[PDB]
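User: Thanks for the earlier help. One more: myoglobin. Can you show the sequence and predicted structure together?

Assistant: Of course, both are below.
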Amino acid sequence: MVLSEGEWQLVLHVWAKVEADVAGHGQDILIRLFKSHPETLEKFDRFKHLKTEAEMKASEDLKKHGVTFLTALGAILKKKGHHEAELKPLAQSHATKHKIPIKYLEFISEAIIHVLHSRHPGNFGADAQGAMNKALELFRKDIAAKYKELGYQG
Ligand code: HEM
């Protein structure tokens, strides 16, 4: 698929707001994911033991990983579709080392949309959400194709 420049602009406009607080957004998104789909927490050997949201909020390791994750995602979005180089190392580690099924990429896509909608209602109207969803679907389609080449396709 291909996004129009207009759609990329909507995506990068709300992303510019997200970047004013990378650690906070990273925290919110990971917590939303873990509460909504607890099974995903089991994939993180470092956080697997967290029992409550309060424990999640206080975890320095969780916050640090939220930043690492958001920074990588931001770098991909800023490529506006020309992200092949960025996707390679990411697809290899998630398919072969971490073993993350495509299903889980859809779950985090929902968490991202939920948090942006909660925190940025004025910059995340229906058109902006549609553009963001399209951007994430593009990302998922490409990662899925790479998974297949790598011999996984979760
Ligand atoms: C837009 C989606 C995603 C991006 C951009 C992303 C990015 C990253 C980055 C940059 C790291 C660091 C280095 C590496 O291991 O490659 C990482 C590690 C990891 N990711 Fe993701 N990730 C994504 C989705 C997911 C999902 C959906 C899950 C699980 C449900 C997941 C589980 C993990 C785990 C288990 C690690 C390693 C944690 C550790 O250091 O022990 N990732 N991810």
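User: Great, one quick takeaway?

Assistant: Residues 31 and 90 are 22 Å apart (CA to CA).
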